[PDB]
UniProtKB/TrEMBL annotation, chain D:
Belongs to the universal ribosomal protein uS5 family. This is Small ribosomal subunit protein uS5m. It is found in: Mitochondrion. The chain holds residues 324 to 430 of 430 of the full protein.
TrEMBL record, chain F:
Its main location: mitochondrion. It comes from the Eukaryota. The chain holds residues 2 to 110 of 130 of the full protein. GO terms for cellular component: mitochondrial inner membrane; mitochondrial small ribosomal subunit. It is found in: Mitochondrion. The keyword Repeat does not apply. The keyword rRNA-binding applies. This is Small ribosomal subunit protein uS17m. One of its GO terms (molecular function) is rRNA binding. Belongs to the universal ribosomal protein uS17 family. Keywords: Mitochondrion, Ribonucleoprotein, Ribosomal protein, RNA-binding, rRNA-binding. One of its GO terms (biological process) is translation.
Amino acid sequence: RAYRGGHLTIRLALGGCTNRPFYRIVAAHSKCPRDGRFVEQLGSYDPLPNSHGEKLVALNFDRIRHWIGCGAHLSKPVEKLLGLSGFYPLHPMMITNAERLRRKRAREVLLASQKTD
Amino acid sequence: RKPTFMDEEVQNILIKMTGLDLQKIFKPALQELKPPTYKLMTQAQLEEATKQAVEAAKVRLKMPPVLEERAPINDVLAEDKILEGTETAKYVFTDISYSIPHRERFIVVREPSGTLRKASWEERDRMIQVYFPREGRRILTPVIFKEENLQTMYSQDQHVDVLNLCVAQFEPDSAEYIKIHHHTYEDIDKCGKYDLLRSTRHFGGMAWYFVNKKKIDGLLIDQIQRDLVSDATSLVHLYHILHPXXXXXXXXXXXXXXXXXXXXXXXXXXXXXXXXXXXXXXXXXXXXXXXX
Amino acid sequence: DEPWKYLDSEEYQNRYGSRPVWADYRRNHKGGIPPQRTRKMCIRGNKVAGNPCPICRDQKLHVDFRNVKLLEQFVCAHTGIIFHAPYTGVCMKQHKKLTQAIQKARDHGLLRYHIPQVEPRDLDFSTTHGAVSSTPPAPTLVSGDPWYPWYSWKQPPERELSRLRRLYQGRLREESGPPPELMPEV
Amino acid sequence: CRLIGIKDLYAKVSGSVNMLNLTRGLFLGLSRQETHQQLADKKSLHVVEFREECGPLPIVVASPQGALRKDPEPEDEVPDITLDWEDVKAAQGMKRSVWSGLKRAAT
Amino acid sequence: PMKGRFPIRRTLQYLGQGDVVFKDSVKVMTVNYNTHGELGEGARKFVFFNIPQIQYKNPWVQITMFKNMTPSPFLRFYLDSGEQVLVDVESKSNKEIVEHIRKILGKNEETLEKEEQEKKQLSHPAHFGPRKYCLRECMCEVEGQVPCPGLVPLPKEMTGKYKAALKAT
Amino acid sequence: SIARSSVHAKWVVGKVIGTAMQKTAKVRVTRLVLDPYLLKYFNKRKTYFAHDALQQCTVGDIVLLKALPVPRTKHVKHELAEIIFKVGQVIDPVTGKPCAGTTYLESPI
RNA sequence: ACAGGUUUGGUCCUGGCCUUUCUAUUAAUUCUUAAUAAAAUUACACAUGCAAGUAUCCGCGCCCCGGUGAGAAUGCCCUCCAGAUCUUAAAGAUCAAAAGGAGCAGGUAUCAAGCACACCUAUAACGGUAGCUCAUAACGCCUUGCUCAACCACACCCCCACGGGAAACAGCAGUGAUAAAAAUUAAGCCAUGAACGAAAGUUUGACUAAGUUAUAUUAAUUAGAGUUGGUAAAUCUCG
Ligand SMILES: [Mg+2]
Ligand SMILES: [Mg+2]
Ligand SMILES: [Mg+2]
Ligand SMILES: [Mg+2]
Ligand SMILES: [Mg+2]
Ligand SMILES: [Mg+2]
Ligand SMILES: [Mg+2]
Ligand SMILES: [Mg+2]
Ligand SMILES: [Mg+2]
Ligand SMILES: [Mg+2]
Ligand SMILES: [Mg+2]
Ligand SMILES: [Mg+2]
Ligand SMILES: [Mg+2]
Ligand SMILES: [Mg+2]
Ligand SMILES: [Mg+2]
Ligand SMILES: [Mg+2]
Ligand SMILES: [Mg+2]
Ligand SMILES: [Mg+2]
Ligand SMILES: [Mg+2]
Ligand SMILES: [Mg+2]
Ligand SMILES: [Mg+2]
Ligand SMILES: [Mg+2]
Ligand SMILES: [Mg+2]
Ligand SMILES: [Mg+2]
Ligand SMILES: [Zn+2]
Ligand SMILES: [Zn+2]
C-alpha cells in the first residue's frame, strides 16, 4: 500500500512449516510485512542441513548487485550470508563471535582441567 | 591427425550406418492417448507427408554428444581460519542468474574448515538441478544404476531405455555417463544384440566405443548376416579413419579396396575372430550367386 | 514373501483365470455414484470387514515391488498410469501400498514405464571457463595472509584503551581479549 | 456396448432417456457408420491416421481400390460444420460441473 | 456453438489462430466496404472472417467499418505520427488483403518470438512461491532437503519443546 | 520531447452526433468488443466532445479526433483533426472524385 | 453428470421437485495417542496486566507491523505521476496521493426520466450561447468487502473531525450482555522482521516455541455411529 517512507531493503522472508524454517531472500519495502509484498525475489536460503550435510543458499548476484547499486539496505543475516560467499567482505560481527567463542572454549578447557584435577 | 565424433566424415558415415526405420523411430508411447486425427490425401500429399516424416525423424535421431571425461576441479578461493571454529555444517552458495550457461555458473562452498572452496562436479550439477529443475533428473542419484538393476534391465532387452536414462540424468562429460554407456555397450557386444540400437540415435555411440575398443566383431558379423554390405564397408572405412597408420589400414588401403577386397582384407587383418568374418563373408557371398 | 509363486499356482490359475484380480469384485455403495474414495482400511486387527477388496480378501496375495505380475494388473497397459482406487475397488491402505510399490518397481526397472528422449542439458559445453578452471589463486593467498588486515587481531595503543576506560568509567567491564588461536575441546 | 464388443466409447444422452428410444437410436446410429474403406472409395483418396503418440508418422489406414485420384482437395480456412455448443464449451474449460470429472468404478 | 452461419468463427481456437499483429504505430483502422458488386467480393469476406481475428490479437486498436460510402472498397490506417496509410482492396482475394496488411504494418516473426521470450524469462525456475507464480513452493519438496512435518514427523531432538524441556532441566 | 495526454484515446474516429455547443462537436465513437459468453464482436459506443476552431462539423460527419495534450474541460479532451467524410459530400480517397454511394458523380475520362 | 426416483388404469411428450458427489460451520451420539494446519457469533459494552522505544542532549521513531470487514456498488485492469523517503561525485530506485480512461464489473425498469447535471470567451471573473446525462439503462433503491504471491476501506459515533456526544481492547490475553456458534488473564527476543543506534546492543503480545479444541489431513496404540420397502449396499422374530 502507500506508505509514509522507508527504504528498499533486502532481507529474509520466512516461509516455513514450523520447526522446519526456510527463507526467501527478498527485495522489499521496509514498511511492508515480513511475508507480504515485495519488489522482486532474489534468492532463497535453507537453514536446515540436508541429506548431504549442507545448508543451501541461492542468490542472484547480478540482481542483488543491481539493487544495491540502486541503494537497497541489507539486513544483518543477509550480510552474514553475503559475507560467507565472498561476494562481500566477511562481516565484523562474525569475527567477533569467532573471538568470543574461541575465548569461551579456552576458558572451558581450563574449567575442564581444573575440575579433572 | 584429428578424428572426432563431430567430423563430417564420421557423422555422415554414422548416419548412414544407423538407418531410418520409421516404425522404430516413431513407435507407440505410454503417454495418455488422444483420439487419432484423419485426413484424405493424394498420392502426392502422402509422398510429401512421408518426406515430412523422414525430415522430422532425423531430428529425433540426432546423436547424443560423446565427449571425453572431465577432471576433478579442486581450487580454493580463500582461507580464514578464524571462521573454522564456528563448527557449522557445510554452506553451499549457488548463483542463479537466467542469462548464464550452466558451465559458466558460479558454485561455491564454505566448509567447517573455514575455507572457500569451489563446488565439485557432481555437487555442482545437483545444485543446478535444485534451482534449475530439469525433467527426468533426480537430484539424488536413482537406484537403478546399481549392477543388479542394470542386469535386470538388460535381461528385459531394454537397453535403449538405460541409454536414454543416462542422457537425461547425468552429464555427457561425467564419470557415470561414461561408465554406464560403455558398460552397456559391453553387454550388447557379449549378447550380440547390436541390432537393438540400430534405428536408435544411440548407434553413434555403438560405433565409436567399439572402433576405439578395436572390437568390430559382432557388428561386422551381424551386418553381413543382416545382408548389409555397405554398412560393413563404411565401418571398415571408419576403422581406417580412426586408425590411419597400422599394417591393416595402410596396406589393405593402398594395395586396393572395395566391398570384397577391403572387407575381406580387414577380415584377415582384424584377428579377434577372423574365422567368424571369413565364415559369414563367405555365406553372404554365396547367397548372392543363388539370388542373381 | 516369495511373490512369483502364487501367481503361477494352480490355485490362483483356477480362481482368477487370466482375467485380472478385482475383475468380478464389486463395491456396494449408497446410490448411482460411489463415494469418491473407497474405505480407509478393510482390516483392523483380526477383523475382516464386509465384502473385502480384491487384494485383501485373498491373503495369499502379497503386495511388494517384486511381483510384476500382480502390480501389472493395477496399471493401465496403454497409459502406463496407475488406477485410483475406485476404478479397481481396492482399499485406501492397499492403494497407497500399491502406489509406493509400483514406484520401487520402476526404480528397479522390473516394470516398464515411458522414458522420453531428452536432449543434453547444455548446448555448448566448454570446460574452459574461470568458474570451472582453477583461477590464479590470490596474491594474498600465496603469502599465507588473511584476506584483509582486519581479520587479524591487533592489540591497540595503551592510550586509546585507557581513554576508552576513561569514557565508560563506571560501566566498564575489562577482561583481556587476546583470541586463543586453536579451537578443539573435550 | 459390452454386447457388441465395443470397449472404448464416450456417450452422452440428451432429452428423454426412455429406454426403448435410446436403444433404437443407438442401433440406428452405430449402423449409420461410414467405414474408412467406404470413405476412401467415395473420395478415391488415401486415408491417413495421424497418431499423437507416434508423432508425425503418416500411417495409412485405407486405400481406394480402383483409381487413386490425381486431384488434391480444397483446404478452406473456413470449414462449415454444425458445431455443438457442448463440445466447444468443453474445449475452452467451461464445463465446471462437479459431476463430470468423477472417478467411477471400472468399465 | 449452434447459431450463427459460420459458427467456427465464434470459437476461441479460430481467434487465436488468425495471424496479424499490428505495429505499435497503428491506432485506428477504418474498413470501408461495399455490399453490391462482384469486385467487392473479397473485401466482404475479410470483414466476415478476418476482422474478428485481427481485433482479438490487437484489443487496443479501434476497428471501425463503414458501408457503401465510397463506390470502391478500401482500408485506412491511422498511425501515431499522423501518418495516414491507405490500402486499396478491390479485386483482391480475402487472403491477399490479409497478407498485404501483414506486410505493411506487421511485426517480424523474430520480433514476436523475442518479446514472448522476454516475458517467459520473467518467471524464474529457482524461486519459491504460491503455485500460481512459481513451481516449487516450501522446499518441503526438493529431494535432499528436510521433509516438512506434515508428511514426515520430526526427530524428538529437533522439536522446540524437547530443547525447552532439556534446557530447563 | 514532452507533449502528452494520459488518455488512451490518442486517436479515434467517430460520427458527428450534435452541434449544440459553440465550437464544440459531439462525436460518437464505436469500438468492437468481444462478448465473452457468445464470443462475438459487437459495437460499443462512447461519446466524446471535441474542440473545433472553424466550427465546421455538420451532424453525421465521419470525423478524426486527435487527443489533446492538455485537457480543456472535464468533458473536453479532444480536438477535431480532420474530417474524414463530410456528410453528403464524399470524395473517394482512391480516385479523388466526388461521389454518392455506389456511384461517381464525375467519372474518369 | 454415464445419470437415477417421482405426474397416469397405462403410453409417450413436456416439466418441476428430489436422490446420488465434494467442502464448511453448528448440533446430537460416540472418542485412545501423537504430529501438522486451522481457530471465527457479535464495528455490542468493556474490570485488570501488557502490545514502542531508542539514544550522550536534540533527534529519530510511535495503526509500521498487528486487528477488523463496519462502510461503499464499492471496485478489477490500464494510463499518468505530485509528494515522501533511500542511495549518491545528480540522477537512479522504492512506495506511490490526487487526477484520469481502451475494456471488464451485484440485483432490480414496478426506480424512466435527472433537474442545471454543459459548453464559448483568455478578456483576466465579466459577459455570450442553451445546453449536458439517459432504454447500449441516466437518476434511484436494495444487498455486498475483493478479481487474493496481494489490493480497497475503517480506527468510539456525527461519510468527513474544527467543534459535539462522550471517555472508545475491530492489538495480546481475558470478561459481562448477545448468538446454533466458547483457544492460555500462558514463556521467550533464542531465530527472523521492525525501531533506534558509531557500535557492542536495547525494546518488540510482530514473530518464535509452546498451551487448549476430534475442525481438517497424516500415522498408528483406538470402536463406535447410521442404515437395511424402493431410488440405494444390506432382516428374522415379537409387540
Ligand atoms: Mg397429468
Ligand atoms: Mg398411480
Ligand atoms: Mg385419464
Ligand atoms: Mg418432490
Ligand atoms: Mg462443536
Ligand atoms: Mg490488514
Ligand atoms: Mg484481511
Ligand atoms: Mg456489512
Ligand atoms: Mg448503499
Ligand atoms: Mg448498478
Ligand atoms: Mg497513482
Ligand atoms: Mg410492485
Ligand atoms: Mg455567466
Ligand atoms: Mg471517524
Ligand atoms: Mg476535541
Ligand atoms: Mg470498539
Ligand atoms: Mg481481544
Ligand atoms: Mg487501539
Ligand atoms: Mg460471554
Ligand atoms: Mg468453532
Ligand atoms: Mg512479552
Ligand atoms: Mg501453535
Ligand atoms: Mg482426524
Ligand atoms: Mg473405548
Ligand atoms: Zn482391503
Ligand atoms: Zn514445508
